[PDB]
Structure 1
Amino acid sequence: GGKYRVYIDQYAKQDYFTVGYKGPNEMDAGIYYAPYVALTPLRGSDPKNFQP
């Protein structure tokens, strides 16, 4: 109804719902994720058999 966002937990163990809250202020969320490094690739091969 424009009041609450609706999302699905595709791995829900049984059946249930949870209500959360997040304010306009990103800090005001209860729970937060705070990355400083992500998805950085590593590439080479091992000379013992030269497999990648």
Structure 2
Amino acid sequence: YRVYIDQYAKQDYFTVGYKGPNEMDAGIYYAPYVALTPLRGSDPKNFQPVM
């Protein structure tokens, strides 16, 4: 058993899981799509940058 802490835990528990060898056999999928595309800009009224 790989024991991962849950550092933020409101009560107490343990969740005994499963992870197969595949990334297909999981039980939940985190599927990224686009990752942190940074945007920039500035508003010409005050000329002070936003991001």
Stretches of 4+ aligned residues off by more than 4 angstroms? none
Shift of 1:44: 1.7
What is the total number of aligned residue pairs between the two structures?
49
Q: Which has the higher contact order (CA 8 A, sep 6+)?
A: 2
Give the alignment's TM-score, normalised by structure 1.
0.85
Q: Deviations over 1:5-46 (max 9, x none)?
A: 011111100111101101011111010110120111011211
* Bigger fraction of residues in strand: 2
User: Could you tell me how far apart the structure 1 residues matched to 2:7 and 2:28 are?
Assistant: 20
Gaps of 5+ in 2: none
Shift of 1:48: 1.1
Root-mean-square deviation (Å): 0.8
